[model samples]
Target: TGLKSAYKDNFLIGAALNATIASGADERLNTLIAKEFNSITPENCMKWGVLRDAQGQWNWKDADAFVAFGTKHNLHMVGHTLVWHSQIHDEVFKNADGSYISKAALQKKMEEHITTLAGRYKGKLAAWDVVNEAVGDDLKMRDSHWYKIMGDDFIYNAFTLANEVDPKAHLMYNDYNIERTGKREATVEMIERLQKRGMPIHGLGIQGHLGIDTPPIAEIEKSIIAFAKLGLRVHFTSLDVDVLPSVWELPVAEVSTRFEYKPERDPYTKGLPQEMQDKLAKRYEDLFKLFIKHSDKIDRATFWGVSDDASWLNGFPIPGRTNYPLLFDRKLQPKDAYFRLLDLKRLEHHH
Candidate 1:
């Protein structure tokens, strides 16, 4: 029943492990996890904000529990996210006057953080996402605390520090929307910048946070091959469909910014209809084909979460809407999407 075993020769199928699921509080979820996934990424516990409480004072409660669960299950533990803009504690690198801290001070803080966190779980983890989502959609370095203080050099420093601490762990630069043109070029160039300096970067994490309409499979394939060309392993970190309905009739350029999310706009609040379920299944089928095609270059394909109920898309842009975005339903049963993946695996092996 292990879905991961079905595609063992292809790649590691991973799932995000949070407190409830990892704690085995939900028996059905636990059963599905054991049967479906071989790898586990700590959903939010290992993030900067969750790990560092009010700067310097580290909190190891959730992270320890997550790692313990992965250990008990003998799962490939993927330490998510060493550095992200949104996950940092507010006072991490801020001066008393609200100005940015010095570059050297920021670098030191980053090194200490990496040394302690990555060093703590050095041999335990299979890979470490050294930096997460540091690039903006326009391919510019995001205005993060790290970027604001030390600019793009923060990315290189992050990988360098992570390698120093956890040399054995595969270090990756993880980001979303990099499948598209602008972000993809920027990410490739940024990785090249690190490579030129002889950084210890080993992988590139494409957080497959895709919707139904955007970034076609061909584009994703291009990014994969391009990243592989740079001698970096491609980790499809998250795979979940987004079926949120958009009410806007605006132009394509304006649609990105003009969409509104309101409680009254909730559609499919009760359950996703069969038609939409079929659509999502097809989406999964298409993406699964891409994953199989690039199995050589791709390292892992991890779903953002385990099931629909646990998905962040539930009330994401619009509240009160019931989103069916994952491979499983609320009851922890296989949805059409799950079968689509299986079907692909079946065809792959049969052929």
Candidate 2:
């Protein structure tokens, strides 16, 4: 697509824009997005971590810049993450009394954040991952502090409230493992139950955040059929695999000319090596082929972050190690995965 408004029926392609939103950085953000995509998702914008790292007093300085940049470039932005568990800075949402924030208080926070942000950038947004990655590692609705305190009503309240705030934007329930039938079944059941009760859901975030070893195209298609059958649009959000060194051997780490080969002590960045990087490159090729084949069900596809350096794949949980899980290298140059991704065939339009 030549412009954001130009993306047609096929999946709208985009990259997460945290790097581009670095305070005064406009050149990259405003550069010809037409070459790569027409869709844009924020890496940190709607997260509780970035927007309210300090509570009540908010900071849209970065997010606002992004929306305006997208508008100027004719890109239709997708509002990330109205609610999530990780990437959540604890201080903002916790109660002052040293207890978890009450359901009412947290809900209020959600209300104020989404309503204000949505209202602030109304027309430019066409889609939103109203609540992100709600499913847990076990593929169940994660019992996040919000889920625990709010008792399922958290999601319902969030979606309903967001709809009231920006009725024009599409609401979504995005999650990983959604491509897994077992987990996908849980998500479908959850959505089906909600629909039976008349919830305001409008879309599903099918994060193509696939693994190096899995999610066959057939399974992905099956998951799409299951969700689309629920009468909601499906979007591939935060789509990137966390690649590790060869599964056969311990990972090789290269930090400042030091080549240390060892098992990943930390899962996120620990097990990374040159072998994993090369495999991830090949894996990206294999996966994008699936996305291209099933582009019909996928409405929009977004990479989690702009580059490997910005990716959380290198940080805590699996911290202090080098991981290459995104499309760009540290130097902001494209990688094998990058080339493979942009090579996909698409119906392009110039305006």
Candidate 3:
């Protein structure tokens, strides 16, 4: 009847809820969320900046509602991003006097933040993105503010803090491009080092924000196999297949990158052509098949948004462009990709 039920045996099917749906402002979307998904992640409400901004006041209204809705629906909640370089509170690195905090002070702040947030929702969350996008494409640690202040140990500290607060929740290191060669090697090396030191890192979250014709399927399989060998659970945390042409030469999901929109680049202003829709459907089918093949290794597969209309891709890499990325279209109707994925499981059962 829904993706959650359809894939119940394989893995938990999930979606990221925006503030509107999470706060119950949009009844239609809320109904869809309850019907289709068994797990939920806050698209932005749980981020540091949104949770606690420069004014030094906690904004728990939307986040509290998000968790409440999940509890009411009996959905497995995933706490996104206890620590990340981007979208962070302004006070994190700077003191009230507008001076940079010392490394030791920063660590204390991080510990307090993780303890307060993760500790609040300890047993309710099924997992947490303890650290996000810490590795770069060069197979080295990203020189983020956290890295510049606390160095590579920041990653270790964040995970350690989250574990101390919520021992039951799966602590994950989440990032994009970890499915590619250089980033994959860097992430694997980092996780191996953390494991060696007895960090309570439980899983790796590959933000499966993919393009139509890039990062060949073989590469994805290889990374999954590699991570599984390390004895860590794998999760496709933020999944959406971008069918549009790329603005960057390489596929990177760094939030800082942006480009001016061009008419030629935003070609699908009218609507996605039928041919392109079919291509997207095929891409999703293949990706889901691969996920099903490694279902034991994967604990969940979550779409970045409920439908194409609300996807971050619309404004990412360029402003105001139409993107048909998810299995649901702008009208909140299920696309062909949705049916094909469901049939994939049924066909497998028959065989």
Candidate 4:
């Protein structure tokens, strides 16, 4: 299940939080978030890149402000990440002797961050993306330095350690591409391996980063069933559809970097042939049919980001190419995708 049906459920709902940095006002994403979502996470604001960009000297100015803002909105917020390989500054990774930090050192810093941050908002946040995108497109644990130093047990350590710090907030192994058979196998193995260690593994963050043509509904259903059997609660994190330029022929010649697939070429724009627009409202409804269908096994679903303008899809895959991969558009108006999602919620409540 993606964002559309993930929230508005009687059970659990969550949204990604992003604030406008320049004016210190709520961005359009935050505005829509304040109105529609009750659960939240700093989409990017709380990441290490933003939280401790300068190293040892902690700077939680932006993140702490966002936390206060979320508290005012009465949202059940979460931290986007805690232990991660990305956006790692050199200072944190390297010793003064020009050597990498030992695993113990790494764990020490990780605990410092998790405890300090989670301790600040211990009871407020429902959970944290303790580990994010650990697996790659190939469904393998990334061979980043985090793995090289921490060893295979890092995942388990991250969860158990976070538990020791923020015993209240849930811990999750977050990643994408899990709908694929190969990826599912890898996730199951990882979670099972962690369980084998008796770690406080709370849940799985199966980021619903389903590509435009990926994860046929049947495949998604079966994967959820299998993952549920593992006794791990599943979360549809980073849930968005990528309607890529599936044009049979790549541009024969270099086109403008601003190239956008023509709507006419994509009857599937909203579930037609290709280049799906998410129809603002329709696609969200259609996707929710799958989500509500499997609510029995799902715990929560978190949209990766707030709106199209703030979403990563616009500049992803190619430079300057644009893609609409979110629940709302630039104007903060609910496209057809938005309302259809609400309708799906209404109908599914009875089902």
| Best TM-score among the predictions, by candidate number | 3
Weakest 10 consecutive residues of candidate 1 by summed lDDT: 256-265
- Candidate 2 vs candidate 3: the lDDT winner is 3
Residue 39, model 4, lDDT: 68
lDDT of 4 by residue, 117-153 (tens): 7787788777888888777667778887778788776
Task: Write the residue-wise lDDT of candidate 2 on 173-212 in tens digits.
Answer: 9887788877899888888887777779999988787667
Could you tell which candidate, 1 or 4, scores higher by lDDT?
A: 1
Candidate 1 residue lDDT tens string, 1-351? 567987799899999977777777777777778888999998888888887777478889889988888887788988988888886766878877788779998888888888899999999998999888888866688877788888877887888888888789998888888888788998888889879998888888898888866669989998998999999899899777788765534588766654456554566777888999998989888998998899999889999999888887776655556788898898888998888888777766442
Ranking by lDDT: 3, 1, 2, 4
Clashing pairs in 3: none
In the range 57-101, model 3's lDDT, one tens digit per residue, is 787998899999899889999999899988986578877787778
Superposition TM-score, candidate 1 onto the true structure: 0.94
- In candidate 3, how many clashes are counted? 0
- True-structure lDDT of candidate 3: 0.88
Flag regions of model 1 displaced more than 4 Å: 247-260, 349-351
lDDT for each of the candidates? 0.84, 0.71, 0.88, 0.69
